[PDB]
Structure 1
Amino acid sequence: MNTVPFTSAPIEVTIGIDQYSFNVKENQPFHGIKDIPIGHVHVIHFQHADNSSMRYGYWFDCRMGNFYIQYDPKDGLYKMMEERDGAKFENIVHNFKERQMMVSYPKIDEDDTWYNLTEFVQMDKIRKIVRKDENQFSYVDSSMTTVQENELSDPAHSLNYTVINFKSREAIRPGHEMEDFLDKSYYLNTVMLQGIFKNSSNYFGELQFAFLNAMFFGNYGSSLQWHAMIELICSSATVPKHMLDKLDEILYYQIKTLPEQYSDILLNERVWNICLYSSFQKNSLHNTEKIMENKYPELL
């Protein structure tokens, strides 16, 4: 079990760690989060009590180094940093634990929610979507735009999601216009799976990462990416059976986890109605269709 110590909490802030969140008061003696499960990517996220504008946060994996948070009163945010001195870090963490100034990652033993939301998500893939190679962790916030959003403006601070465009030469083979537009199997299987992602795991990893950025930061471009990647599978007549079964599970845990109150801004009515009721795969997502119908019958 790993630890992300905090130098201090000089400003009042809501702190998220994965799907959990805690209120810290201005100058509360808070020195960080312990008992963080090894084996998964994690996100530590922030919303200042005084400006509920800009949710922001850090994707990290504790296997890739020793990370801490320290408030920067110049840039006005909690920054993730790497401690390269292993002894300094162990000594810091041990003091704060002994003094019990750390909240414990509050995992229920039975509860697989975070595994189920992050099954295919890998830190090395996150670092290619979020380019800042001098750090081993990745910063995301509410306002960051996608490469695709920028085509339709600072490239260094963009989300480099794979561009999906149903009305593009990439998506449509010359002389197969009607066929490729009404059945996207070619686009899914040859262009994206074989050509760009290499396997369904990398495809699902990007889909899951896009959902979590949508939910945790209300990143609009991430929401568009998550919907596009669902719609490309649902609009394909030919999908491997294992991908359909896995997509049903992925979407089930995402729908189960979404705050009930955010369904209106995070769920696209057109895409979901199409995917569950019109698409080739309308009968292939039993778990997802059942949770959607029982939790968000309004949307449909």
Structure 2
Amino acid sequence: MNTVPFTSAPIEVTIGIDQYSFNVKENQPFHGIKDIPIGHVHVIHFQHADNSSMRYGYWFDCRMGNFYIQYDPKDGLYKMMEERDGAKFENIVHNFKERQMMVSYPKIDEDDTWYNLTEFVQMDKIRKIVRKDENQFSYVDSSMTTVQENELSDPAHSLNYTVINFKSREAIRPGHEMEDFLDKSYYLNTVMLQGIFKNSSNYFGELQFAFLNAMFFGNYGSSLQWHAMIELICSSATVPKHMLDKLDEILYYQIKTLPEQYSDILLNERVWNICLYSSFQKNSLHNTEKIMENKYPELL
């Protein structure tokens, strides 16, 4: 059970850890989050009480080091940093637990939600989408744009998602124009699965990471990427059966976890009505279809 201590909380902020979050008042004595479950990636994220713009946060994995939060008053945000002094850190953490200034990661034991949202997400793949290799953790915010968004400006601060584009030479073999555009199987299985992602789990991990960035930070380009990776599978007549059943599970927990109030900008009407009702895989997403219908019949 790992810990992420905070040096202080100088400004009023809503702190999130995974799908949980807490209100923290200006110069309230808050000094960390304990009992963070080992074995999964995590994200800790922030929204200042004064600037409901700019949600931001840090993807991390406690196996990869000892991380803490510190407020930087020059840059004006909560920063994740790594403590290299292993002893100096158990000291900070133990003394803060002793003074009981830390919140407990509040997992219900029956609850597999976080595992299901993060099954395929690996910190090593996250660090390739958010390139900043001096740090073992990854910063994401509301306004970061993707590499695709840019082609149509600062690269040090981009989300290097895999570019998917249905009207491109990559997507369309010469001679199979019509076939490859109506049935994307070629582009999914040879180009993307065997070619780029190598296997289905890295693909699901990018899909799942894009969703979580869209959900937690309202990152509009992540949402585009999430929908595109869905659409590619659903628009392919030939998908391994194991990918179809896993996808249904993946989407179900994503749709389940979405805030009810946000289903208007996070959910793309056309992609979903196509995937659930028109695509080759219309019949392969029973659990995802049933929860969409019962919870957002308006969008359909």
Pairwise TM-score range, normalised by the shorter structure: over 0.9
Please give the per-residue CA displacement for 1:249-287, whole angstroms capped at 9, x wherever unaligned: 000000000000000010000000000000000000000
CA distance in 1: counterparts of 2:86 and 2:241, whole angstroms: 46
- How far is the alpha carbon of 1:26 from its aligned partner? 0.2
CA distance in 2: counterparts of 1:218 and 1:113, whole angstroms: 20
- How far is the alpha carbon of 1:27 from its aligned partner? 0.1
Please give the per-residue CA displacement for 1:184-223, whole angstroms capped at 9, x wherever unaligned: 0000000000000000000000000000000000000000
CA distance in 2: counterparts of 1:260 and 1:91, whole angstroms: 42
Aligned to 1:29: 29
Please give the per-residue CA displacement for 1:44-66, whole angstroms capped at 9, x wherever unaligned: 00000011010000000000000
TM-score, with structure 1 as normaliser: 1.00
- How far is the alpha carbon of 1:177 from its aligned partner? 0.2
- How far is the alpha carbon of 1:134 from its aligned partner? 0.2
CA distance in 1: counterparts of 2:176 and 2:47, whole angstroms: 49
- How far is the alpha carbon of 1:150 from its aligned partner? 0.3
- How far is the alpha carbon of 1:295 from its aligned partner? 0.4
Q: 4+ runs of 1 displaced by more than 6 Å?
A: none
**Backbone CA RMSD of aligned residues:** 0.2
CA distance in 2: counterparts of 1:77 and 1:32, whole angstroms: 16
Aligned to 2:4: 4
SS of residue in 2 equivalent to 1:242: helix
Please give the per-residue CA displacement for 1:29-81, whole angstroms capped at 9, x wherever unaligned: 00010000000000000000011010000000000000000000000000000
SS of residue in 1 equivalent to 2:216: helix
Aligned to 1:95: 95
CA distance in 1: counterparts of 2:184 and 2:260, whole angstroms: 32
SS of residue in 2 equivalent to 1:135: coil
SS of residue in 2 equivalent to 1:59: strand
CA distance in 1: counterparts of 2:246 and 2:10, whole angstroms: 43
CA distance in 2: counterparts of 1:227 and 1:183, whole angstroms: 17
CA distance in 2: counterparts of 1:292 and 1:223, whole angstroms: 17
SS of residue in 1 equivalent to 2:15: strand
- Unaligned runs of 5+ residues in structure 2 are none
**How does 1:229-248 map onto structure 2 within 5 Å?**
229-248=229-248
Aligned to 1:163: 163
SS of residue in 2 equivalent to 1:3: strand
SS of residue in 1 equivalent to 2:263: helix
**How does 1:151-230 map onto structure 2 within 5 Å?**
151-230=151-230
- How far is the alpha carbon of 1:123 from its aligned partner? 0.1
- How far is the alpha carbon of 1:17 from its aligned partner? 0.1
SS of residue in 2 equivalent to 1:190: helix
Please give the per-residue CA displacement for 1:107-157, whole angstroms capped at 9, x wherever unaligned: 000000000000000000000000000000000000000000000100000
**How does 1:1-300 map onto structure 2 within 5 Å?**
1-300=1-300
Identical aligned residues as a percent: 100
CA distance in 2: counterparts of 1:87 and 1:239, whole angstroms: 50
